Amino acid sequence: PVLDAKTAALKRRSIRRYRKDPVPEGLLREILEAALRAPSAWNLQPWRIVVVRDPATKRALREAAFGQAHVEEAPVVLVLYADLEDALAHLDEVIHPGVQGERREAQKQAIQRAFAAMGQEARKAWASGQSYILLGYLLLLLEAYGLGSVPMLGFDPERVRAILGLPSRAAIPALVALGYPAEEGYPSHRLPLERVVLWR
Amino acid sequence: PVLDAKTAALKRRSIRRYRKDPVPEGLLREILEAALRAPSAWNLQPWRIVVVRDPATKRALREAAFGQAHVEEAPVVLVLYADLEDALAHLDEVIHPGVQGERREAQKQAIQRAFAAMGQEARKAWASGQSYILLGYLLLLLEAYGLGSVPMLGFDPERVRAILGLPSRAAIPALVALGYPAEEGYPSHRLPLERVVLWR
Ligand SMILES: Cc1cc2nc3c(=O)[nH]c(=O)nc-3n(C[C@H](O)[C@H](O)[C@H](O)COP(=O)(O)O)c2cc1C
Ligand SMILES: Cc1cc2nc3c(=O)[nH]c(=O)nc-3n(C[C@H](O)[C@H](O)[C@H](O)COP(=O)(O)O)c2cc1C
User: Fold this and answer.
1) Which own/partner contact pairs does B151-157 have at CB distance under 8 Å and 24+ positions apart?
2) What is the rounded CA–CA span in Å between residue B181 and residue B32?
3) Which residues contact B45 (CB under 8 A, 6 or more apart)?
4) What would the 3-class secondary structure string for chain A be?
5) Crossing angle of helices A25-35/A120-144, nearest 10°?
């Protein structure tokens, strides 16, 4: 009974306490397959995910996340990383299958030229930005399936790269702890609509 | 009959041709109120939205977006901008209402200190990243309500800032054209799950 998207967005709160029940791999795969349909500029999809269930690795990530207890307690921690260089080395995988021959090359050169003119920090920030569209899809879908989650930026990226063996060029836009909820979550407010939106 | 979140994510395609029917302001406000419940680091919510319906302004934005015709043809264009300095000047609006007295100050100083040590480009990229979580929520909700959309980065940000009178420090993570669909949209692929996800 997956929830409608409006109820999911209005009811979500971050959850930091979880039941001890495992999350079935079949259920996780259905959620990730739907979240990976998120759109990105030029269909580049620079996002990459590590699903961490091993207890020793979760304990190591808890230390990298300044001791946040939910990293170790949740049944599953997702590491969302962005690898622009892996995307650019495999551009034929993201170009539309109908766009072939000479059209494919012109699209591929325009993309390579745009990124050849950018530094390492700018590339990481661009690929991280696109990865946050996928994060928005994933948080709404986790709520719609009845799972709780907390996205995190409070961690040392150098330690996370070392524990998992990630490339030095990768950016890590978030860790996400998830599982079946054992708490309601705290009420949080948002700015009034009229403070954020201007009508023209 | 808002769609369930899984069907919305799996069926969405970008739409670039629209009917001439207007989008009622009451319907737009319900969608934006649900999308503005997206989460952000420290609840900072650095996103700001301009709803553009004026025909002359849409024509000016079409030129700024290198002539993309859907900017002028859609009934509504949303301009998503990020203003980190406006968020930091009003930190009392985002701090939890129960966190008062001395606790409020310690939270506010930690936030101000983190951003005082960053340059203008880094601040814009950080606020743009958080704004893409809201973009993910908004694209899924527009599909769930039966509207079509296309998010865009193909535009000159200096021209958009001038047309709307935005601050020089603002980043513009996307323009979004939307309306009732007049086309099915093109089929697009995503990478295989096993290419993007590693199980540990
Ligand atoms: C990108 C990002 C990073 C965040 N980092 C942390 C974190 O490191 N630890 C934590 O407990 N919550 C963290 N949060 C949770 C946010 O504080 C929270 O989403 C926000 O206060 C609104 O609360 P809600 O998610 O309950 O609606 C983060 C959220 C996002 C979107
Ligand atoms: C941040 C962003 C910027 C994009 N910019 C443009 C644009 O300037 N013009 C356009 O026609 N489509 C643009 N697109 C649409 C993308 O090409 C498209 O989302 C992707 O090819 C997958 O197609 P789908 O959205 O139909 O699933 C953009 C998408 C995103 C997410």
Assistant:
1) B151/A39, B151/B14, B151/B175, B151/B176, B152/B65, B152/B68, B152/B71, B152/B176, B152/B177, B153/A41, B154/B65, B154/B66, B154/B68, B155/B61, B155/B64, B155/B65, B155/B66, B156/B64, B156/B65, B156/B66
2) 19
3) A190, A191, A196, B36, B87, B94, B130
4) CCCEHHHHHHHCCCCCCECCCCCCHHHHHHHHHHHCCCCCHHHCCCEEEEEECCHHHHHHHHHHCCCCCHHHHCCEEEEEEECHHHHHHCHHHCCCCCCCCHHHHHHHHHHHHHHHCCCHHHHHHHHHHHHHHHHHHHHHHHHHCCCEEEEECCCCHHHHHHHHCCCCCCEEEEEEEEECECCCCCCCCCCCHHHHEEEC
5) 120
Nearest CA owner, ligand 2 atom 6: B152
Structural determination approach: X-ray
The CA–CA distances, whole Å, from A88 to A42, A123, A127, A170 equal: 11, 11, 11, 13
User: Ligand 2 in contact with B151 (CB < 6 A)?
Assistant: yes
Q: What is the CATH number of the domain that holds A49?
A: 3.40.109.10
Q: Which amino acid is located at A184 in the chain?
A: E
The number of folded domains in chain B is 1
For residue B80, list its beta bridge partners: B49, B174
Centre of ligand 2 to C-alpha B65, Å, is 13
Resolution (Å) of this entry: 1.6
Q: Which residues of B touch A143 (CB under 8 A)?
A: 5
Using alpha carbons only, how large is chain A's radius of gyration in Å?
19
| Look-up of token digits 């998830």 | A178
Contact across the interface for B10 and A34, Cβ inside 8 Å: yes
Bridge partners, residue B178, by sequence: B76, B149
Q: Which residues of B117-135 are buried (b: 16+ CB within 10 A; e: fewer)?
A: eeeeeebbbbbbbbbbbbb
**CA A28/CA A77 separation, integer angstroms:** 12
Greatest CA separation for chain B: 56
Which residues form the domain of B166? 1-200
Q: Is the CB of B153 under 6 A from ligand 2?
A: yes
CB environment B57-89: b (16+ within 10 A), e (fewer): bbebbbebbeebebbbbbbbbbbbbbbbebbbe
